[PDB]
Amino acid sequence: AAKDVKFGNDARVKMLRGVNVLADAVKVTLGPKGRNVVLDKSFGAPTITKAGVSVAREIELEDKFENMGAQMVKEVASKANDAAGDGTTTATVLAQAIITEGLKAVAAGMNPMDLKRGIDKAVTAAVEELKALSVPCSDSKAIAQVGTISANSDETVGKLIAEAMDKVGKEGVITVEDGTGLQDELDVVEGMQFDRGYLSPYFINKPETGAVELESPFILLADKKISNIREMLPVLEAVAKAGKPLLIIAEDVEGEALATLVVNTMRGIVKVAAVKAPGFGDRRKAMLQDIATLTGGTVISEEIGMELEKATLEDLGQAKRVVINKDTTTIIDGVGEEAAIQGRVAQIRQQIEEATSDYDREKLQERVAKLAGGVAVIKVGAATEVEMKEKKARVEAALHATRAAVEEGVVAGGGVALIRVASKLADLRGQNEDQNVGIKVALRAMEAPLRQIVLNCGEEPSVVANTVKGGDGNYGYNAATEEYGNMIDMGILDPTKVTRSALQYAASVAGLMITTECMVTDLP
Amino acid sequence: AAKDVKFGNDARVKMLRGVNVLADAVKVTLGPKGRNVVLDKSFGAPTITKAGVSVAREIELEDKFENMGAQMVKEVASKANDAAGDGTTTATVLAQAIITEGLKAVAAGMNPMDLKRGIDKAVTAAVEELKALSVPCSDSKAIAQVGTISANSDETVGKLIAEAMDKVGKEGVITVEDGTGLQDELDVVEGMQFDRGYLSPYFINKPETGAVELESPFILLADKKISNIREMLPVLEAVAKAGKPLLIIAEDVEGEALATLVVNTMRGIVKVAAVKAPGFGDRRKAMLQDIATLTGGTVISEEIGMELEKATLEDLGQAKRVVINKDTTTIIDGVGEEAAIQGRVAQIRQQIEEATSDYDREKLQERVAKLAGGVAVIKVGAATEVEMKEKKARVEAALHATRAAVEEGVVAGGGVALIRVASKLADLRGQNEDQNVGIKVALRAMEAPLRQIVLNCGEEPSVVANTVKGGDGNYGYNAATEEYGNMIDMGILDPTKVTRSALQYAASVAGLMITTECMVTDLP
Amino acid sequence: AAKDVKFGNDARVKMLRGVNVLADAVKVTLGPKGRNVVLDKSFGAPTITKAGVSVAREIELEDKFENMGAQMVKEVASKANDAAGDGTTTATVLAQAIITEGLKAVAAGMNPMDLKRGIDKAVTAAVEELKALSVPCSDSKAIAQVGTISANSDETVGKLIAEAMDKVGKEGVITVEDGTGLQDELDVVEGMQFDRGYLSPYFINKPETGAVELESPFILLADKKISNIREMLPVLEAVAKAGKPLLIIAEDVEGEALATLVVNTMRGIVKVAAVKAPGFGDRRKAMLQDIATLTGGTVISEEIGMELEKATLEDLGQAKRVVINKDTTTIIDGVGEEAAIQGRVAQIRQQIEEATSDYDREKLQERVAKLAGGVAVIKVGAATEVEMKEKKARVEAALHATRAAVEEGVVAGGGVALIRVASKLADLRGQNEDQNVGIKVALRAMEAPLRQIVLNCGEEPSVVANTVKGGDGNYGYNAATEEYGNMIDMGILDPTKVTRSALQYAASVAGLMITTECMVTDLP
Numbered sequence A, B, C: 001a002a003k004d005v006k007f008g009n010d011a012r013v014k015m016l017r018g019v020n021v022l023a024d025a026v027k028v029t030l031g032p033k034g035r036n037v038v039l040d041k042s043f044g045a046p047t048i049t050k051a052g053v054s055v056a057r058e059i060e061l062e063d064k065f066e067n068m069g070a071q072m073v074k075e076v077a078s079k080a081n082d083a084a085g086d087g088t089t090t091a092t093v094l095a096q097a098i099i100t101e102g103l104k105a106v107a108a109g110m111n112p113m114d115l116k117r118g119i120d121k122a123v124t125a126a127v128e129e130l131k132a133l134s135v136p137c138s139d140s141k142a143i144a145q146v147g148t149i150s151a152n153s154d155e156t157v158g159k160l161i162a163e164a165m166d167k168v169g170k171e172g173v174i175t176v177e178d179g180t181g182l183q184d185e186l187d188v189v190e191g192m193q194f195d196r197g198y199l200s201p202y203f204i205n206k207p208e209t210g211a212v213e214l215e216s217p218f219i220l221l222a223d224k225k226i227s228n229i230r231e232m233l234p235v236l237e238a239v240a241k242a243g244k245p246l247l248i249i250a251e252d253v254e255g256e257a258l259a260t261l262v263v264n265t266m267r268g269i270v271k272v273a274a275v276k277a278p279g280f281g282d283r284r285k286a287m288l289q290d291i292a293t294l295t296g297g298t299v300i301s302e303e304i305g306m307e308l309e310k311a312t313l314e315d316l317g318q319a320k321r322v323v324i325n326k327d328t329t330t331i332i333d334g335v336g337e338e339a340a341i342q343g344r345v346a347q348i349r350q351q352i353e354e355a356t357s358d359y360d361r362e363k364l365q366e367r368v369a370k371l372a373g374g375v376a377v378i379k380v381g382a383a384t385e386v387e388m389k390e391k392k393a394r395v396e397a398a399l400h401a402t403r404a405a406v407e408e409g410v411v412a413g414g415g416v417a418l419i420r421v422a423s424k425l426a427d428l429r430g431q432n433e434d435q436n437v438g439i440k441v442a443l444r445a446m447e448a449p450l451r452q453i454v455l456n457c458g459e460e461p462s463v464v465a466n467t468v469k470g471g472d473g474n475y476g477y478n479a480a481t482e483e484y485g486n487m488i489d490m491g492i493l494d495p496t497k498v499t500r501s502a503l504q505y506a507a508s509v510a511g512l513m514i515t516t517e518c519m520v521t522d523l524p
């Protein structure tokens, strides 16, 4: 299509206009006294949210140039969210400050590229300063605090994530779903448990419900399917010579073998249950090995010379109790020694260097949690669907925030961190005057979060800013109680990772964005 | 469709106007104090770039005639990019100048054709003068400098390309992709390395991680599948008489074969590994020939008289050491003679210089880089996707600029080269006055790059130009430090190839373009 | 659709207007001081050309009637190009002159049909007169000159096609393609070359690229395909006793025989190559006989009593050198005596004197050209694609022009020839006054070319016309050097064929066009 082209001040003003539309559209959700946004959707009912990224994503402008600007600044929120999962609004505001002040510096006639350079320098130094200021977050109290703040000061979330991480372990895997009831409910699975229930409902035990429990059970593992039942002679007879109940694991077992199983179990000669393999292809075997080590038995595999026939009482695994229900399989206690299990945890460390980032991390934490650890599922309660969506979003985000807080530590919230590191980099300089101006632009922009929060609280931002800048250390302004004090002692802490990320991303996009001298877009 | 037609000055003015829209759209991106351009995209987010070609490709006008002009001059930047990969803007500016003064001369009533002739002669002579002026750049310092300048004065890129070219070789193959982290990372793989790791991790060697190393290994390769292993009697038994370890390569190997193999390695009679085929269909074979020749053995194929049974140790390949892990396989040094690998690099150089033009180059260069000349892969680091695209693009262009610099040498940047060869061609004449005017058009137009740079720096161009012409040799104006001096000592070098290419292309298209007397297009 | 109809002076004026649009659009490209035209293209970048036909083809008008006229006059340029390949503008201008002067005569109230009659007669006499004035063009100099003039006075092209025809032969085949490099490059293939490359790329020789050359090669030729390979005992045995390499030509060769063949070449016991039959049905056999005659061997044929098995070294052919590549097969020197070729060429001469006169003439002449008359491929060098297109086009046209010059001879350029034959037909009369007006219309129109060229040079056309008519013989006006003189001695030569063609076509189409009294077209 024929293109519309614009140059210089015209284009820059246009862009800035679009950017500011997006920014103003996002900013209303910042701070403890922030406000929500409703997004219409072509299909169903609209969405209410406080999460900046969503509103940014929904934003699109009619004026092609304004559209361009907004569509470029959206990447701030998007990348921020994709990276850490919180503080996206902060990032956006930073971006706006850098872009505005930057363009102002360009209007003085200064070299844009050098401005970008200065900004980049300042931001790098700031990142190092943050990495230094970062304080480790280990106690359940602090974690509760981060979770609370990331959920917009809702301590329910704090205590919830607290109980979760406390029970599973500080690194263990936690997931969250839409709840059934109105109140938040936490489900926790301890020890070895996985999907796929029993095959034949014909099996029953001492309790009801169809779930089968076994006393001092024996475990077998196989790679292939089975069809013959006479072929199970060397094993079954042995078990028939022991009297002890048996458990079998493979991808499947056909109707006739299961029939034999049901008949022999019903006549009461031996109690046996059968359950399909957990995963697919390589993964199911990779898990079968660890299950074997946990039980104490040895894996049998058709892909190796060892056949289904050759089966010994040492190849069989051992446990104290096993329970299998309709959908899930559960092992209570494997006789595998603590040294063996610990060694398994050792060998697991090798499996980390194959990311495949969060997919490898999720599968790895999944298989690891089936050891001494555990799995936590948070079911978020709400009255109506909108409440459900927003609440779940906030809870997820809170989880990500606590995770990042554990990973890279925390710094004093209320955006006082940026003020502190700027005030520390006050003496930072560049290779020439314009670059110095760039440095000053970045630093000046670093005050933006706090003052924006204060603006959203209906209080004079310049004043609060200056009064906070006048202080030292973790001195900051608590917006909820409208009083100054030590932010950490008041429990307002932002994960270092999210702040660092915000600053970096915003600095990148804005730094490039202020280097525009020409724009080409489609003609209307 | 019914056509609109225009003659003479009307058409020419229209054309010039279109050309000038494109030209101005490109021109803003020239020089160290140059500025960037934003291109809207029909699909996703907009693009920031400094690449003249990109903006040129994106340009299209509403007035059919202006459009004709612009769409004709875009080919300059395009052909320039396809040829050298840098200096496209320079070519564009040259074209604009030539077109303007040319059209002025035509409006003076001079014969356009003779103008073309004069321009062409002047340009040829200029090219000869440049190839004469060309100064070779072999050393790491200078290469670092040209790579640096092509990357808009970013010495990170220069030093990076330097380390690359140093490790792989000045002619060896280098590739570059978008990185994962924020900082640039360089990986270099020496010898033979490619995808597809082992299938069964059950067999292992001295190291951990599952990776297996072999001592003076023997290599096998097959085109089709297999099922029997007893049919491999004549080879395996022979190896059992040799003791040397074996490797197998095919599309895959079946379960029972894997069983026999794993058992045989576990019992410790012979250590052997098997890996799936690298490519697909013809490609995997085309590479299999190369691996066979590198090892020294001969390819076995079912489509030829040689069967799966018939296998000897002369067709079988040999190497000194091989390491294979989960996903990739690596051979360091094949015992295949240097004559074999050399003959093969010859043959591959032959097979690339035929296939055309774009689709083939990636797979073919992939096949080329896998020999004794290692392959270096540069991972470009960036904060956000936009920065990634622009930085990566600039890096590729810079790589091309350095390669072209190696191929044809360098001359003093700042476009002073053109000024100098112009000052040298002062006594050049033609067969008549009009051709002299053409020559003069070329010569005067050759000042355009430098003066344009100075103009972009916000300095008076005529003055700087005259002060540079007043000097001699590599005397030029460094715009970054805003000071005159020896361009070479300042590290401002333009590859001769890019300069020559620019001038020639611009000369062709403009030379033709100024001979227009009629234009025909569709009706609006 | 409902029709718009127009009569008499209205219609004629409309028609004339359209005609003049096309005419004015074309005339600008006439002469050495001619100018170019730009044609927009729906897909990619526009085309620059001097070729009248292209411009004529692109023209189309909105007014249905004007459109009608132009669309009728396009046929002149089209047929002219299909016939000779040059002089199309000349034809067009003649057409315009005839149409205008004619329409004036019709508006005088004279009988249009009689005008047609007169024009036709005058033109007939003129063509005969041209046949008389026609001077043979045999020497390399004259040919070069014609090539130069047809290439818009560029002696590079003249000398190039001259060298082409000189190396290849006055009867041999010459082709032209887009070059790879920047300079014009001539490739010449000596001795028999045709389609169909190798079958299996598996076999290779001393050179690379996959193309195989043979040393003092031996050739066999067959009519049918094969499936068995052992039955070729009498052949293979011979080569197995001789060691000399073999070449085979047949309809095809199946998979297993080709497999044995390639394996046979790989083990290195016998060097052999295989290539598909040249033509189809009658042509493949008819030429296979010729290959047999040139090599010295005898054709083997299944359709004749001699079997594939019974084959002796007397039936088998021999050659000096053979090179066969991916698509083409080439034999350098057949051992067949010089006398042998002549007799076959004789029989072909007998096959020429038959009915079917077109397609057969082409097949027969190619087949005749397949002997000592070498093949030339001209690779046209240029910097960019537009230059490439225009230059290649001009080169083809020049080639056709020289071919025609050789075929039917040459006459003095500058359009002085037409003036001469007009002045000769001054005393020509018809059957009535209106027809006299017709012949006079033709004659007056015949001055148009010269007058138009001078008009394009910007000098008074009437004066130069009169000064040239005032002279005698080949005295004419050279526009390039702006001086009068003997045109033949000045190297301005026009093929008689192209001029004759121009006059004839224009006379036909215009002659018909001026007899219009009604026009019927669609309603807008």
Ligand SMILES: Nc1ncnc2c1ncn2[C@@H]1O[C@H](COP(=O)(O)OP(=O)(O)OP(=O)(O)O)[C@@H](O)[C@H]1O
Residues within 6 Å of the ligand: A029, A030, A031, A032, A034, A050, A051, A052, A053, A085, A086, A087, A088, A089, A090, A149, A150, A152, A153, A412, A413, A414, A415, A453, A477, A478, A479, A480, A481, A492, A493, A494
């Ligand atoms: N009670 C409080 N007093 C002072 N500052 C607070 C308080 N609660 C939160 N903040 C500050 O507000 C910021 C969080 O704002 P908000 O939760 O509205 O958006 P965000 O988390 O920055 O981004 P996202 O849109 O991803 O949620 C934090 O940086 C925090 O320091």
Ligand SMILES: Nc1ncnc2c1ncn2[C@@H]1O[C@H](COP(=O)(O)OP(=O)(O)OP(=O)(O)O)[C@@H](O)[C@H]1O
Residues within 6 Å of the ligand: B029, B030, B031, B032, B034, B050, B051, B052, B053, B085, B086, B087, B088, B089, B090, B149, B150, B152, B153, B397, B412, B413, B414, B415, B453, B477, B478, B479, B480, B481, B492, B493, B494
């Ligand atoms: N610091 C400097 N001082 C003087 N001249 C410079 C400096 N940096 C670059 N140049 C000149 O600028 C030119 C390169 O400009 P730039 O990299 O902006 O675009 P380009 O490479 O010409 O075109 P493109 O990159 O779009 O293909 C070089 O010819 C070089 O001589």
Ligand SMILES: Nc1ncnc2c1ncn2[C@@H]1O[C@H](COP(=O)(O)OP(=O)(O)OP(=O)(O)O)[C@@H](O)[C@H]1O
Residues within 6 Å of the ligand: C029, C030, C031, C032, C034, C050, C051, C052, C053, C085, C086, C087, C088, C089, C090, C091, C149, C150, C152, C153, C397, C412, C413, C414, C415, C453, C477, C478, C479, C480, C492, C493, C494
């Ligand atoms: N230097 C010259 N002096 C005089 N007449 C010339 C000269 N050059 C060419 N001509 C005349 O111009 C005619 C050819 O013109 P031109 O090559 O411009 O177009 P064309 O061949 O008529 O048609 P086309 O556009 O198809 O090439 C020839 O008949 C020749 O006599």
Ligand SMILES: [K+]
Residues within 6 Å of the ligand: A029, A030, A031, A034, A050, A051, A052, A089
């Ligand atoms: K928020």
Ligand SMILES: [K+]
Residues within 6 Å of the ligand: B029, B030, B050, B051, B052, B089
């Ligand atoms: K550039």
Ligand SMILES: [K+]
Residues within 6 Å of the ligand: C029, C030, C031, C034, C050, C051, C052, C089
């Ligand atoms: K022409």
Ligand SMILES: [Mg+2]
Residues within 6 Å of the ligand: A086, A087, A149, A150, A151, A152, A397
């Ligand atoms: Mg939040």
Ligand SMILES: [Mg+2]
Residues within 6 Å of the ligand: B086, B087, B149, B150, B151, B152
């Ligand atoms: Mg550059």
Ligand SMILES: [Mg+2]
Residues within 6 Å of the ligand: C086, C087, C149, C150, C151, C152, C397
């Ligand atoms: Mg011509």
